[PDB]
């Protein structure tokens, strides 16, 4: 069994790094993120060669690194997509979880 890394994983392929914590996501199945590939949950870095390596943010197909972290209507849920769903219409949760600035994700 794969073990979940500690907290404080820095995601830094772009100019706006974000910190991922496995602890605050304990209510999500590993599989909602480390999703099935060729019938089998894949645990390599999202941005691996042949995976979401398209660094062109005005690129909307399955390969886009920006797309998979922010887009709605994606087969598996993006960071922003699932957060929009958790926040509902609560203004405080929308700012912390879905805000583009001054949120838990981006300064
Ligand atoms: C519409 C709302 C948002 C805007 C406009 C925004 C904008 C951006 C931009 C411009 C970048 C850098 C992409 C590059 O230059 O190639 C980025 C990266 C990123 N954003 Fe956002 N962001 C938003 C909200 C959020 C939130 C709330 C989350 C998390 C739940 C988040 C997760 C990320 C991730 C994980 C990265 C990539 C980190 C890296 O590897 O450097 N974003 N975002
Ligand atoms: C016990 C539960 C889970 C397992 C076993 C697990 C395991 C892992 C492992 C082994 C890595 C490091 C991979 C690498 O850098 O080689 C990883 C990274 C990370 N995990 Fe998970 N995780 C689980 C749940 C989650 C969930 C629910 C999500 C989000 C809600 C998540 C999102 C990520 C992200 C985005 C990374 C960093 C990927 C990269 O740096 O590109 N994980 N986790
Ligand atoms: C934490 C890890 C990862 C994240 C956050 C992530 C995110 C996503 C999202 C949101 C989608 C749907 C895109 C859309 O519908 O347009 C997707 C699909 C896809 N991703 Fe990932 N991904 C990760 C890891 C991987 C890696 C390592 C691979 C390659 C082995 C991979 C290959 C694919 C493929 C092939 C698709 C289409 C899946 C299908 O059509 O069943 N993903 N991913
Ligand atoms: C790369 C992956 C994503 C990013 C970067 C990310 C970022 C984080 C952030 C920064 C927090 C606030 C707590 C802390 O700082 O750790 C958090 C909260 C959480 N996220 Fe994510 N998230 C991601 C994926 C998603 C997805 C895909 C889901 C589930 C499908 C989700 C569900 C939640 C929930 C339920 C919480 C707790 C909200 C509450 O305590 O306020 N997240 N996320």
UniProtKB/Swiss-Prot annotation:
Keywords: Electron transport, Heme, Iron, Metal-binding, Periplasm, Signal, Sulfate respiration, Transport. Binds 4 heme c groups per subunit. It is found in: Periplasm. GO terms for cellular component: periplasmic space. Heme c 1 binds at residues 22, 30, 33-34. One of its GO terms (molecular function) is metal ion binding. One of its GO terms (biological process) is anaerobic respiration. Its main location: periplasm. Participates in sulfate respiration coupled with phosphorylation by transferring electrons from the enzyme dehydrogenase to ferredoxin. This is Cytochrome c3. The lineage of its organism: Bacteria, Pseudomonadati, Thermodesulfobacteriota, Desulfovibrionia, Desulfovibrionales. The chain holds residues 23 to 129 of 129 of the full protein.
């Amino acid at each position: 069994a794969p073990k979940a890394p500690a907290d404080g994983l820095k995601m830094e392929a772009t100019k706006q790094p974000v910190v991922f914590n496995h602890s605050t996501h304990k209510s999500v199945k590993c599989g909602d993120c480390h999703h099935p590939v060729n019938g089998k949950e894949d645990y390599r870095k999202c941005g691996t060669a042949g995976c979401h390596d398209s660094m062109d943010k005005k690129d909307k197909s399955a390969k886009g690194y920006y797309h998979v972290m922010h887009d709605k209507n994606t087969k598996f849920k993006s960071c922003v997509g699932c957060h929009v769903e958790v926040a509902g219409a609560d203004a405080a949760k929308k700012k912390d979880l879905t805000g583009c600035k001054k949120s838990k994700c981006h300064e």
